[PDB]
């Protein structure tokens, strides 16, 4: 629906929608920008991520409310409405994964861009895995695992341990281990090693980079405090 808008106008409107807290609009503008076929800048990648994380975050929060009501109940209405929200969440995940596969990831040559997109691929397979219950659930989980793993391999070879995308990737892969893969010891080990290796690299950073890194480092510490 955004094929007739200029790329730069779509980007400008995505930023306006963020200020207006209109995240569905933001996501549609950023989807249109991606479909122009040009690679995304660092700032544009962040806009894409923020938009869809907010959209799917609201859907996940609703799904969790309805799932809890449904489990306490165990008429068809609660199940039906949970299924409606579930289907809409899966549709958004499929949309993002489709943008990544056509053709963001294959054109991402730099480590920063490629890791960013593989992290997103892991995240949206994780969100699919949160609601999955059928024949493909193990394959959905393994698709999340495989995307996170390739991103970690690249990030460990190509990025400093304090890089915010590397830190966020490890954070989310550790949540995957704890919440999805039923591997809490793997989750704890990854969070601790990531935190310790970033701590030892802080001395190389400017004050602004230091603020970025320690912000995500605190989320790793919050989880370790919750998990141990």
């Amino acid at each position: 629906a955004m094929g007739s808008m200029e790329r730069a106008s779509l980007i400008q409107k995505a930023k306006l929608a963020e200020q207006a807290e209109r995240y569905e609009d933001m996501a549609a503008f950023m989807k249109g920008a991606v479909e122009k076929g040009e690679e995304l800048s660092c700032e544009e990648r962040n806009l894409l991520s923020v938009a869809y994380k907010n959209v799917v975050g609201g859907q996940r929060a609703a799904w969790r409310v309805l799932s809890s009501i449904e489990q306490k109940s165990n008429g068809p209405e609660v199940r039906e409405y949970r299924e409606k929200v579930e289907t809409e969440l899966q549709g958004v995940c499929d949309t993002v994964l489709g943008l990544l596969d056509s053709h963001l990831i294959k054109e991402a040559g730099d480590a920063e861009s490629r890791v960013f997109y593989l992290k997103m691929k892991g995240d949206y397979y994780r969100y699919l895995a949160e609601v999955a219950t059928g024949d493909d659930k193990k394959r959905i989980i393994d698709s999340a695992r495989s995307a996170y793993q390739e991103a970690m391999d690249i990030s460990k070879k190509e990025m400093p341990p304090t890089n915010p995308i590397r830190l966020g990737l490890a954070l989310n892969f550790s949540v995957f281990h704890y919440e999805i893969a039923n591997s809490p010891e793997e989750a704890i080990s990854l969070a601790k090693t990531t935190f310790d290796e970033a701590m030892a690299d802080l001395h190389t950073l400017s004050e602004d980079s230091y603020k970025d890194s320690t912000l995500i480092m605190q989320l790793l510490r919050d989880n370790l405090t919750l998990w141990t």
Partner: peptide, 7 residues
């Protein structure tokens, strides 16, 4: 209930 990456 654990924290994934967030702004």
């Amino acid at each position: 209930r654990p924290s994934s990456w967030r702004q």
